[PDB]
Amino acid sequence: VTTEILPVSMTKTSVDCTMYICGDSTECSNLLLQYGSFCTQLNRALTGI
């Protein structure tokens, strides 16, 4: 009998890009919005995984 060990899944992490960059900051958030969808796309990519 032999043992074959294979990974199946990753920890289902999720990162809120706004909270990460501009946690609880109105002034930072307003500047972050100048980057358009960059923040949104990052949240979407991690959700998909």
Binding site: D16, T18, M19, D24, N43, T47
Partner: protein
């Protein structure tokens, strides 16, 4: 929502309820069956210390 003639014929109030939040998040006036992340719950401070 702007129709073919450029007239606004409908709208979603993104802060009315959780379904409207989902519609605005997905940039659609129709929401398909499923679970969607639309926001982030945060407890606010009540005192200044």
């Amino acid at each position: 929502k702007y129709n073919e003639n450029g007239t606004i014929t409908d709208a979603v109030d993104c802060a009315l309820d959780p379904l409207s939040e989902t519609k605005c998040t997905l940039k659609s006036f129709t929401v398909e069956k499923g679970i969607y992340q639309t926001s982030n719950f945060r407890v606010q401070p009540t005192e200044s210390i």
